Amino acid sequence: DPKEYVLKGFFYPASEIYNSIAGFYDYGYLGTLLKNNFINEWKNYFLRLHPNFWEVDPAIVMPKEVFIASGHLENFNDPWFNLMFPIYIGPDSQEALNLLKNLKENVSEQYIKDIIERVKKMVENEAYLRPETAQGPYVMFKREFILHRQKLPLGLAVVGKAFRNEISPRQLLLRLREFTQAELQIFFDPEDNEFDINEVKDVELNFLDKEGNYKRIKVKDLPFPEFYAYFVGKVKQFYERLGIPEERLRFRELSEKEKAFYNKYHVDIEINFPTYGWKEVGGIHYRTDHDLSGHMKVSGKDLTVQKDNKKFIPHVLELSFGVDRNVLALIDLFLTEEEYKEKRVVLKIPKHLAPIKVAVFPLLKKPELIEKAKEVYNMLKNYFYPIIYDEQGSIGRRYRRVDEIGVPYAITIDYQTLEDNTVTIRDRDTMKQVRVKIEDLPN
Amino acid sequence: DPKEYVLKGFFYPASEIYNSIAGFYDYGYLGTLLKNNFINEWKNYFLRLHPNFWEVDPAIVMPKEVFIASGHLENFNDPIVECNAPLGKVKWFNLMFPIYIGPDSQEALNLLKNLKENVSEQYIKDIIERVKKMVENEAYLRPETAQGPYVMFKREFILHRQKLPLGLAVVGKAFRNEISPRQLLLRLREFTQAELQIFFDPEDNEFDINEVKDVELNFLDKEGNYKRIKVKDLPFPEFYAYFVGKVKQFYERLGIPEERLRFRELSEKEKAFYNKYHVDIEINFPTYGWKEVGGIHYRTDHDLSGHMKVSGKDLTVQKDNKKFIPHVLELSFGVDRNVLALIDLFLTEEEYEIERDNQKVKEKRVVLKIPKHLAPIKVAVFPLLKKPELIEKAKEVYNMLKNYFYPIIYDEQGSIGRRYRRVDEIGVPYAITIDYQTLEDNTVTIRDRDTMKQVRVKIEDLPNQLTL
């Protein structure tokens, strides 16, 4: 039951106090911290895969010709409604719409002329909210490739907003109209062994091939070229280190009819959500030279790279991740109702991802303890942020409160703390408490 | 000339290979790192000012009723007028971008895009008809982040145990249909703001003025008196002066030179109506002159009052069995404008003297003297020559160092002086060179960006190099 649970600080219907529009959510104080924890783990893992991988931050709004080249204007449709959001740059749209509402059949041709001319300028001045972040790196490749001394591979990563006018948003963060993607675009020469399969050859993964065979398999045995299998391996290890239960992680190779047309290879990263079942949270797409070729064609700019008296269009390997979907997976996978004297809700999120990592509690709302806890709180601030302080209510009620939102360690000041300067550390999972010298709290 | 410098990795006209739209930029590899360094500094400073201050991430798109309450739909206007022909009347143009949710847009706009002078009378009844349904389902791209915390206050207030003060901070995108975008990152249609909304009881006094009472700042009042004063001398009550003082200290730690920072009080005519106190943070750009990079606004209880009225939801707080609407103090920052200040303030044409050939010679260089702790790339690693032994040793150094600094520039192209010049220009504090002596005694040389001095250091001892 994530729906009511996420209201405890993770995310809420956007502009909750008005009639919220479906497919938009505001992240609360815990949702914001958890998503940034994922984003920073993601950035540090994927950017560090190679010395020439870099984050860029392209603008959300892009010109019409971008999506001529990318094919979104022609093909990005649902039964035909195109899902891209136009944005009308300039004042013509406002003037046009204002004319439209007071319009009547008994007007002069001038009123009609004014409408047609305004719309003529509005369509001319029409851009789009990007429906995916990948287009950013593609249009930035030409300049960035020079700046990094014309080296391949070149990786351009984006962690940013995208927009889709989904007819029927559903299932909280799975199907949104506004969302965050994290995508690494790898521009590379398909004729040299840039990436060493020996780094991941023995990585093991749950693989559902396109014929429906579900198997445990080593990266070296995957039915793909080494450069592609290498990154299936790296992506797997990212999720291993995120702490995803091995049973609930698999990689699904899409068939020729299910995959996007320009993905020569399309493998979805899928997580078995306790509430929704298996759902993709990202994908690994080999797109040959389709992307830069289309942009070279439409833009008129030379997007080729020179090697050995030869010029060619770099190939693209895309590693794409729905950030909001991964965040929902961290909630759904670790939200546990346990019984042992009644039943407690506990968020068993891996410690290194927990939105709030420590809570400090005076055993009782007496100033002799309150003074000691505030001191403890003030020293721990230099080792962790943010930190919860709470002195109100029962100590068991406060323990239950922080377990509900996944805090790994609760620290309690007691009377013995006043004597020997030792506090108790309560482990969120085991619920065991061990006494520790205040000066040994960093360990 | 700054227009050409920033193309060395900071930011580029958006979708540069196409016909770029004015007022939109893509941040390149250095611009992204620099902007994230500012954002991370900002967050760590302002979120830690008080224990109940939290970052939130509201959606960019908001229902139209948000901007009925806030007044943006009615008041958020640019004056527009329409060679050597006479000029028409000056009109207001609203800067908010609508976003048309649902398929009603495409149906209606297909009639608009295909409207002709020969269309039928039934064609007209349907274009009025579809246009109406479109407008009913229209939302807006927010023009500021502030409305996010205001509509989230009700729930978050409860979740943090009904404590005032409550601080909600947003670092995110906002959009404005600006007529004439200009001056790079200063006048944008798509931009990032960092804004902290402080909900508080003004009768209460939860901010100790003694923390900042003697902090000195350049103050330009609404009368025009420019004076350098202590925070306690400010013509505002303590709670307001406290945060003027905290904001000044943030820029002090950022490394803004004292002479290039001032706080200007806006007059009754120039300020926004519901800003009881409105003080702009202004930076003296070498290229652009004095420019606002942020603002400190006391808005009393206007924001929650208006949202409670329009939405109907109870945004009050019970204080001693009396209901009251919390007041808002807003600290607002244009992230793009601050990043541009970090380039423009520090990009230097330097002339100096240095010892070469057993004598002093005169030289000149372009160096970005950005404060070391904000530099987009802190360290560069250079093999002296493109020889396998040096390259291998250099890569070894690069792999050890990336546990202590990230990212790191590695570069083996061109002469060593060429490469020193390249990282001087993009502000890298330290360049590390692996030479033939490195192969002999395992020492490298560290070149300091500011002084250009070289010190040999054992690779073992390298991680002790100071960022300040």
TrEMBL record, chain A:
GO terms for cellular component: cytoplasm. Keywords: Aminoacyl-tRNA synthetase, ATP-binding, Cytoplasm, Ligase, Nucleotide-binding, Protein biosynthesis. Pfam families: HGTP_anticodon, tRNA-synt_2b. Residues 80-362 form the Aminoacyl-transfer RNA synthetases class-II family profile domain. GO terms for biological process: glycyl-tRNA aminoacylation; small molecule metabolic process. It comes from the Archaea. GO terms for molecular function: ATP binding; glycine-tRNA ligase activity. InterPro entries: aa-tRNA-synt_IIb (IPR002314), aa-tRNA-synth_II (IPR006195), aa-tRNA-synth_II/BPL/LPL (IPR045864), Anticodon-bd (IPR004154), Anticodon-bd_dom_sf (IPR036621), Gly-tRNA_synthase/POLG2 (IPR027031). This is NEQ417.
